[PDB]
Amino acid sequence: KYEELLKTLENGINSEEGEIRLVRKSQGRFKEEFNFDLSLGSKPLLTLKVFLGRKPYWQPWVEVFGVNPNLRNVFFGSEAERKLYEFLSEHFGRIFVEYFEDKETTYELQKGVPPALSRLGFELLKLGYTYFRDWFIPEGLMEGGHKIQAEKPKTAEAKARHLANLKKEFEEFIGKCEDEGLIKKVKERYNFLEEEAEERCRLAAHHCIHACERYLALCTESSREQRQHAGDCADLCRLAALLLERRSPWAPAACELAARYALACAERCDGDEPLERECAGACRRFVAACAPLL
Amino acid sequence: KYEELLKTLENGINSEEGEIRLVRKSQGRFKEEFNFDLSLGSKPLLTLKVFLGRKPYWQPWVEVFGVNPNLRNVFFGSEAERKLYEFLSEHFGRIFVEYFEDKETTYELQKGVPPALSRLGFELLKLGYTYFRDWFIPEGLMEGGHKIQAEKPKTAEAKARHLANLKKEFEEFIGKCEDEGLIKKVKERYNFLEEEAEERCRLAAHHCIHACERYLALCTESSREQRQHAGDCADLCRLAALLLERRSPWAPAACELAARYALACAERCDGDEPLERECAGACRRFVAACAPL
Amino acid sequence: KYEELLKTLENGINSEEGEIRLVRKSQGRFKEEFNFDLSLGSKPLLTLKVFLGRKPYWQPWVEVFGVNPNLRNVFFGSEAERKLYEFLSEHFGRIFVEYFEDKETTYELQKGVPPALSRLGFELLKLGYTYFRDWFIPEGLMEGGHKIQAEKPKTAEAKARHLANLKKEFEEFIGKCEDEGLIKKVKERYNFLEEEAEERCRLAAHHCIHACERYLALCTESSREQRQHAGDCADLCRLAALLLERRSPWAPAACELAARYALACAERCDGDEPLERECAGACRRFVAACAPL
Amino acid sequence: KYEELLKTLENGINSEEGEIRLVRKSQGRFKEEFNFDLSLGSKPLLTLKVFLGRKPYWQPWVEVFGVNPNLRNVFFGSEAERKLYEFLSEHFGRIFVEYFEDKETTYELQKGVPPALSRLGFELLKLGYTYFRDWFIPEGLMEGGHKIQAEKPKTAEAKARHLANLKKEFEEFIGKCEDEGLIKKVKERYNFLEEEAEERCRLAAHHCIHACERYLALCTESSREQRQHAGDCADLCRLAALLLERRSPWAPAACELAARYALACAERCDGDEPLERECAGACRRFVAACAPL
Amino acid sequence: KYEELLKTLENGINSEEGEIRLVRKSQGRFKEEFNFDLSLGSKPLLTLKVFLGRKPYWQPWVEVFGVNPNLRNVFFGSEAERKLYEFLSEHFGRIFVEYFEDKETTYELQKGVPPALSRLGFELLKLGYTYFRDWFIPEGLMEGGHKIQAEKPKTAEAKARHLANLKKEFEEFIGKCEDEGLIKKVKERYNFLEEEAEERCRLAAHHCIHACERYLALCTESSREQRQHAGDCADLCRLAALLLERRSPWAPAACELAARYALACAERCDGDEPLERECAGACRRFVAACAPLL
Amino acid sequence: KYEELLKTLENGINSEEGEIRLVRKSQGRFKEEFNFDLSLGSKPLLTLKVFLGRKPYWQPWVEVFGVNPNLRNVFFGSEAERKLYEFLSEHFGRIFVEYFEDKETTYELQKGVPPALSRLGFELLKLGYTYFRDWFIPEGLMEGGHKIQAEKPKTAEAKARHLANLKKEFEEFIGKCEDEGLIKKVKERYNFLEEEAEERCRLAAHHCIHACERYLALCTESSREQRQHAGDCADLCRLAALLLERRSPWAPAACELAARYALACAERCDGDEPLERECAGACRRFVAACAPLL
């Protein structure tokens, strides 16, 4: 677990803004803790502070800080930044990021944007981090207190709680804002999250319906509670589909429901056959397509 | 209006228990207020105290009280009771009924049953009265204070307001009660409503549906957030009937979805024109139908 | 007290609509309780139910009810109504008036107008009744429950308590109402009060002013926090009259300042002596005057 | 039940002020409802309006009202009043008494005395009525609304519920009142109760004590958390009597301890058997006794 | 902006307790951040940690810490201390100050004095800092957590909110205290703030009245809404004046009001003339004299 | 005060897990502040950070941190650990302890055990620390934020408030837990606290009763308010005794009360005699035996 990191950074992480490399390393406060100094090309970029974990009670986390102010406009918002986080998410469930050198994000948070929807928070949201905390402790009191903390959801349940929470704070945010430029930006971000879910739902439903359609169709010895299951599930997935194909905002409400009786259709039509292997199957992939919506 | 009454009561109402007749009438405290004493068969039955209204600010109401105790087990739960309320429901939007002589209603109310779902209150609910109050003022203080008051909803908006609250009142009792017979009785009363509600949805959605088709069709100068609104509303309402069609089990969930984005259509398609008047109208008559679900 | 009454009512009250006469009287439920039926001209008018008091614990009160419907558009809004209340205000600190037959009052109350500012309630407000209750108990439950109850303030302290609350009640209605005619009517009723309140201030400040001059002057053994208190109070009250003098627009702000540090003078200059009795007194009669501002 | 009444009232109740007799009776609004007019000596006294009950859902009640004002200083505070309530307490679990003609009660209620501790309410408290309501609806609105309503406790559980609340109501008044005579009167009324409560404890603990001895003794198949429960309860109750024995000053603190772990015995030793029925029973009759302490 | 500081400390800051001089400097955590070590005379005194700002989203701040315990009773409460803060306010809108070595202030805060009214907080209050935070994080958890943070108000509005807030906490404080010595001290402080405002109001009113007096007096073509404006404003300023001349506590309530119709008089009587140049003028200086009261 | 520490650690603190010794020392942030590095036998163990106090406003405190992860299972839970804290309580009223290297305690806190009843918190509870705070600041935000802080009660009053508080949180805890193993552990701990108090109460009562018994017995010129005092107190102490001898849970409720009228008996029966010297005496020792219960 420790070496996937050290070796990945030793070879380097490439980017169009320069290649990201390890400059210096040092032991952190605990035995499972380390400081990694990084360069971009040859110039100093930032430091990672890492804790590797101690099973079972202590999770790994990584802290990115000490960004070179001279690279702040170059780095923040660059594919360099993206590729670094992509790498970190592969290994760390909790991440902290100092935002002093990030003018965009800084500005946005000060205007009340939910943390998950700021320039920087959304980079992490895209990578699956769902629970956010915005720290802004006065540096005069304690330094290094201007950080976004982000964690991946431990269950399907918290994840939905969190997305529900972000949905609430967004709408609450939309309602109090009076910057036309800012609102538009914030909205592109939600849609993009909404949008990617809607497009997979569009298809999973297609092939959930056809699984349900084909199921009740030719499968010989089935119930009527089951041809009412595959029967109705397919029609839910149909309407869900209708709203999503016209890209209507009321689609996920439809998707959410259709998911329930795809789950109900999945759960109860399954067994050993090829058809209920794929009907219940396609439902569950339909039930799955719906979760990141809400 | 008063002569409509005097004529019916003099004429009689037939029932398995005898004819209900006007015995005697008299002028009340007010100008449009009257007391009608009724007999059932050969015996005295009860009094109606009626107010005919003073439009627009004073609604008509009727109070049923002073039941003959010799007839107490004869009247409550009878065709006589139905025939009278069925009758009264046609002229009064507001009704009061003393339930002292009705042990069922009494017992049920004493054990926490919502008034609309009590033996007596339920008869009124069948006839369209949606708002209920259970009064139980001590007689040592003021005479004439054990009454169920019930009202017809003032608007489609109110009609739905009353029913949603009643659903909420229903589940609380259900969960906190521990008498199965009572619970079975009450659930049964509740269930009958839902089933009748589904058939009410079959049509209300219909004259709601041809209303949204009619709205987005010819009404040109509307927003386009509105035609996605009126557009999606209709199809939600389209899918729903389909489930009641086959009388399907996964139906009440859907009308519940379809009703929420039927309300959003009502709210956002406001207007002075005929086209948006009947559109929002037809949507809202569907939602009221939907509430006990 | 009762003979004062019997004599006046037998004698008559003159008005543009006819003479109000005692038709018939009768002993009530209690010893000092009586019903007086009145005629207006040739026709029956209404009943007064009166209580004469049982000092100190039972205040006198009068209830106006049972209005002749043939005269309903004749009486409400008339010299007859004024003459009766103007009369009643001289003997009863508490009054009840059924407003069923008064559509204005009805409508206004139904649309959320505070009772004191309704057509009917306002007549009572003019006569010094400051505390109001709008009762609207359903007649199916209890007969005789649509009444405005109004009371004269028990103290200068109460007098001001009632009026401050009414100002608060006024602005809420103003802001949430969307009927200009009604709002204009109500603001007009409100405005008339303020204007009359300003002239009430012209004098109340006066016999408040010579009271503080009189207080700090000769009363020696008082604190010195008190003479800055009574001292500043007076001059605040001095500057204020000056603005009402010229009937100036920047006036109501000032009495509002002067009233706050008139209250602080009341509160801190307490005492058994005549000098502090009339000082705090005269300050407090000024504040009550000030409240609707 | 009604003939028990008619006979007693016709017969008379003797007292220092004269014989109370039935003057006249009449059928009320309901079947078991009757009005009895009474005379005291040669003069008319008051009316009883009575309800005999309709088991199980309608408790009997009696309302005392319409007192002869010529006798107002004769009746309230008299053997006549005691003899009537002492009598009524034997047939009615619920009582209403108009207190208009009782200045003491009036004054006390007007000055914030809890009803049970007012002159009138206290007479009822002596007879076992534990739940009180002081009604004071304005007569301009509804006639017959100044009454004390008092009820016998429905269970040992309720009996204690009423008394604990009254203790709480007592200390608030005590602390916020500044009339020593009134406070002395009220404390005196309160004190008399506590003293009588202690003797009530002497026995209730007793038939509570032999009940727990009887419980843990032979009842074998009980938990062992229960025999420490029933075990400790009893000894707490054992130590307590010992302090009332000598009528000791450190006593009320102890019954207060012993009552808390008497309640825990009630709560945890539940059961269908006779042995746990009378055990929890005897514990709970002790706690109700304990509450005013 | 950076050099006004470095040079001012290089020449020195004088005081009767010794001269304040720069001993050592060092780069802080960010590029715009620095540590300045200071001496008093020749002896070590304290360190400043400074952030210079990064327009537009990051304000400058300065942190004073690491006070020599040996100079704690000499330094705290001295003109040396005063002159140092006077200098800092000239350049920094936010300041943090460690109070371990300050027995007076420490004691007072522990007794509940609002932070703005403690020995040390009032030194800063005098210099215009209006928003306060009292930090007392356990040093065992985090060191350097016993600090007063103080900021200047960003608007006239917040300033009044803050003064209102301090007025509320003071009165609330007065009411719960039972130390005769402490209360007296706390009160001298409020008065001094109250007092300095009252004395300028005394005069601004004098010359606001005379501006209004002279205005309605000789100015030929004016309205009656305007001779009611200058007319009434002058009389407000008069009463205000009366209460302030007898030094009555109820004066600022009067001053506050008179300000409104001095503002109303200022706003509406102004235009091109010499007289409304100075009438509206004198009102606005009267409206201005009133603000620091409340 | 400073040297009792330095010398005690120089000679060493012994334990069966090895002897605890000073490795290195260093000056802390303040003049009254120090870092002590410690060894177990010859191996590194942990660091103490100490503040010695500055009378009157600043209490001493000590911070234990930087535990060797390699000794974490050896150290935590060992008599070595016990003896170190025993020593610290003798000199410090406030203590902070880092718990990363403590698997037992860590696990338990994460399950909601009141801090005073965790493995580590109870070690301190036994030593008289009564007020607890559980810190778990994210190390990514600030390191060294996973600590238990514990303080001794400043008065008899707070102490009872605290014990009452722990009693409330315990019962509240018992009610929400669903780990049979964990609950049992948590309960042994409360009982042990409850138990040690009950056993002293058993005896103090014995000799309080006999003090009261002997008092009213032979003492010639006494009141009847006094023979009602010693009279009744003895009987309270008797019942209290009865419940405690059968070890009934309802005993301290009895003990609590009996304490009141032992106090009442103590206070009022005392004076110059040998008997009221010991009666009031024995009561007060009875009143005293009761306090740590609740």
XYZ file of C-alpha atoms in Angstrom, chain B:
293
model
C -84.432 27.391 0.199
C -86.706 27.181 3.255
C -89.648 26.048 1.257
C -87.514 23.354 -0.362
C -87.077 22.144 3.224
C -90.545 22.491 4.631
C -91.831 20.553 1.699
C -89.410 17.667 1.966
C -89.867 17.253 5.705
C -93.606 17.472 5.564
C -93.532 14.970 2.759
C -91.365 12.470 4.591
C -88.166 10.436 4.032
C -88.667 6.631 3.719
C -86.389 4.097 5.407
C -86.229 0.607 6.871
C -87.181 2.066 10.291
C -90.115 4.330 9.492
C -90.970 7.642 7.980
C -89.220 10.756 9.213
C -91.740 13.558 9.465
C -91.855 17.130 10.483
C -93.712 17.258 13.729
C -93.426 20.918 14.492
C -91.362 23.908 13.357
C -90.549 27.212 14.979
C -88.647 30.453 14.362
C -85.175 30.497 15.874
C -82.952 33.117 17.444
C -82.279 34.624 13.961
C -84.229 35.413 10.794
C -83.014 32.517 8.678
C -82.797 30.200 11.730
C -85.398 27.483 12.351
C -85.957 24.401 14.487
C -87.558 21.325 13.003
C -88.703 18.562 15.257
C -88.978 15.220 13.609
C -90.784 12.030 14.351
C -89.760 8.588 13.320
C -92.783 6.389 12.829
C -94.990 7.122 15.804
C -92.315 8.431 18.102
C -90.508 11.762 18.413
C -87.013 11.558 16.924
C -84.783 14.677 16.997
C -84.487 18.355 16.193
C -82.751 20.119 13.386
C -81.541 23.610 14.023
C -80.902 25.160 10.624
C -79.357 28.333 9.215
C -80.093 29.098 5.557
C -77.132 31.366 4.991
C -76.625 35.013 4.383
C -74.459 35.134 1.297
C -71.704 35.634 0.938
C -70.307 35.913 4.407
C -72.488 33.478 6.332
C -72.537 29.922 5.194
C -75.597 27.771 5.805
C -75.258 25.128 8.516
C -77.399 22.524 10.214
C -77.169 21.046 13.663
C -78.494 17.624 14.533
C -79.266 17.223 18.246
C -81.752 16.203 20.875
C -82.118 12.607 19.839
C -84.944 10.589 21.385
C -83.225 8.140 23.755
C -85.898 5.499 23.138
C -84.724 5.417 19.555
C -80.984 5.685 20.141
C -80.148 2.154 19.008
C -82.613 2.440 16.156
C -81.286 5.602 14.509
C -77.493 5.544 14.682
C -76.097 3.189 12.101
C -79.352 3.116 10.141
C -80.779 3.950 6.689
C -82.584 6.642 8.608
C -79.280 8.194 9.574
C -77.920 7.820 6.006
C -81.091 9.172 4.425
C -81.018 12.210 6.637
C -77.378 13.056 6.101
C -77.511 12.187 2.412
C -80.346 14.630 2.339
C -78.702 17.283 4.487
C -75.451 17.000 2.547
C -77.335 18.365 -0.432
C -78.134 21.726 1.214
C -75.614 22.376 3.957
C -71.901 22.694 3.636
C -71.574 22.567 7.377
C -73.045 20.101 9.826
C -73.036 19.524 13.583
C -74.199 16.288 15.080
C -74.441 15.559 18.780
C -72.903 12.169 19.347
C -73.837 11.679 23.005
C -76.335 8.958 22.199
C -73.906 7.116 19.871
C -71.732 4.839 21.981
C -69.742 3.664 19.002
C -68.851 7.163 18.007
C -68.438 8.018 21.652
C -66.204 5.062 22.396
C -64.224 5.605 19.233
C -63.761 9.255 19.958
C -62.884 8.469 23.554
C -60.249 6.009 22.404
C -58.637 8.539 20.071
C -60.187 7.812 16.692
C -60.101 10.896 14.430
C -63.620 12.263 14.138
C -63.897 11.751 10.391
C -63.222 8.049 10.955
C -65.567 7.532 13.848
C -68.811 5.700 13.263
C -70.684 8.969 12.960
C -68.029 11.127 11.403
C -67.531 8.551 8.717
C -71.109 8.873 7.530
C -70.417 12.511 6.972
C -67.131 11.853 5.249
C -68.936 9.697 2.664
C -71.059 12.708 1.776
C -68.206 15.077 1.099
C -67.621 16.794 4.422
C -63.835 16.881 4.769
C -63.117 19.073 7.798
C -63.946 17.815 11.258
C -64.007 19.015 14.823
C -64.845 16.911 17.840
C -66.247 19.133 20.559
C -66.447 17.745 24.101
C -67.162 20.620 26.477
C -68.384 19.511 29.954
C -72.105 19.895 30.345
C -71.713 21.293 33.850
C -70.246 24.332 32.201
C -72.208 24.680 29.030
C -75.090 22.637 27.772
C -75.022 21.275 24.190
C -71.291 20.776 23.797
C -70.768 17.178 22.661
C -70.949 17.480 18.888
C -69.145 16.537 15.750
C -68.803 19.499 13.395
C -68.070 18.706 9.777
C -67.605 20.896 6.751
C -67.523 20.598 3.013
C -64.212 21.901 1.705
C -64.252 25.535 0.597
C -62.020 24.904 -2.390
C -60.324 22.110 -4.273
C -57.287 23.469 -2.426
C -59.008 22.961 0.941
C -60.460 19.626 -0.081
C -56.960 18.279 -0.443
C -55.731 20.066 2.722
C -58.304 18.238 4.841
C -57.572 14.786 3.414
C -53.783 14.908 3.709
C -54.088 15.858 7.346
C -56.524 12.982 7.873
C -54.059 10.490 6.404
C -51.493 11.773 8.845
C -54.005 11.528 11.673
C -54.801 7.976 10.574
C -51.328 6.479 10.779
C -50.606 7.963 14.204
C -53.701 6.325 15.629
C -52.912 3.090 13.842
C -49.457 2.903 15.313
C -50.375 3.860 18.848
C -53.528 1.897 19.174
C -53.520 -1.662 20.511
C -57.113 -2.771 19.893
C -57.218 -4.880 16.761
C -60.975 -4.885 16.429
C -61.047 -1.129 16.574
C -58.003 -0.851 14.296
C -59.558 -3.327 11.881
C -62.799 -1.305 11.951
C -60.982 1.953 11.402
C -58.655 0.613 8.754
C -61.697 -0.811 7.031
C -63.322 2.608 7.036
C -60.109 4.095 5.786
C -59.664 1.410 3.156
C -63.150 1.944 1.734
C -62.204 5.550 1.164
C -58.993 4.826 -0.678
C -60.765 2.371 -2.968
C -63.438 4.915 -3.700
C -60.659 7.454 -4.075
C -59.012 5.440 -6.827
C -62.155 5.512 -8.948
C -62.415 9.226 -8.230
C -58.898 9.447 -9.712
C -59.839 7.475 -12.816
C -62.059 10.409 -13.921
C -60.468 13.432 -12.246
C -57.259 12.606 -14.030
C -59.356 12.270 -17.142
C -60.896 15.751 -17.117
C -57.553 16.833 -15.860
C -55.857 15.127 -18.783
C -57.965 16.507 -21.587
C -57.494 19.846 -19.791
C -53.617 19.849 -20.086
C -53.808 18.536 -23.679
C -56.151 21.467 -24.288
C -53.830 23.900 -22.466
C -50.464 23.368 -24.105
C -52.141 22.715 -27.440
C -53.611 26.003 -28.457
C -52.408 28.382 -25.762
C -49.396 29.809 -27.597
C -48.123 32.699 -25.503
C -47.029 30.725 -22.495
C -43.495 30.218 -21.249
C -41.596 27.147 -22.342
C -40.863 26.182 -18.742
C -44.622 25.953 -18.657
C -45.048 23.559 -21.559
C -42.517 21.209 -20.025
C -44.526 21.702 -16.886
C -47.931 21.122 -18.411
C -46.342 18.554 -20.704
C -44.811 16.314 -18.072
C -47.817 16.730 -15.778
C -50.115 15.249 -18.341
C -47.952 12.223 -19.014
C -47.518 11.538 -15.345
C -51.290 11.651 -15.248
C -51.370 9.469 -18.378
C -49.247 6.684 -16.911
C -51.224 6.697 -13.651
C -54.714 5.851 -15.046
C -53.057 2.930 -16.756
C -52.243 1.420 -13.352
C -55.875 1.965 -12.072
C -57.119 0.498 -15.331
C -55.824 -2.902 -14.422
C -56.383 -2.011 -10.777
C -52.635 -2.568 -10.184
C -50.861 -2.823 -6.789
C -47.994 -0.483 -7.738
C -50.572 2.244 -8.496
C -50.824 4.376 -5.305
C -47.090 5.116 -5.391
C -47.438 6.536 -8.887
C -50.426 8.832 -8.347
C -48.353 10.053 -5.432
C -45.600 10.948 -7.921
C -48.020 12.228 -10.535
C -49.838 14.362 -7.966
C -46.641 16.200 -6.895
C -45.862 17.302 -10.426
C -49.589 17.957 -10.972
C -49.384 20.541 -8.154
C -46.324 22.177 -9.764
C -48.404 22.544 -12.959
C -51.245 24.196 -11.009
C -48.850 26.602 -9.259
C -46.868 27.764 -12.274
C -49.662 27.928 -14.872
C -51.659 30.745 -13.312
C -53.744 33.170 -15.400
C -56.898 35.129 -16.084
C -57.709 33.270 -19.308
C -60.182 30.388 -19.587
C -57.371 28.095 -20.727
C -55.327 28.283 -17.545
C -58.361 28.519 -15.302
C -59.600 25.046 -16.278
C -56.098 23.611 -16.624
C -54.968 24.363 -13.077
C -58.540 23.558 -12.044
C -58.536 20.090 -13.546
C -55.073 19.414 -12.085
C -56.201 20.479 -8.604
C -59.382 18.384 -8.662
C -57.071 15.448 -9.345
C -54.810 16.207 -6.369
C -57.706 16.468 -3.897
C -58.849 13.081 -5.180
C -55.348 11.787 -4.584
C -54.734 12.830 -0.973
C -56.005 9.897 1.095
C -53.648 7.693 -0.846
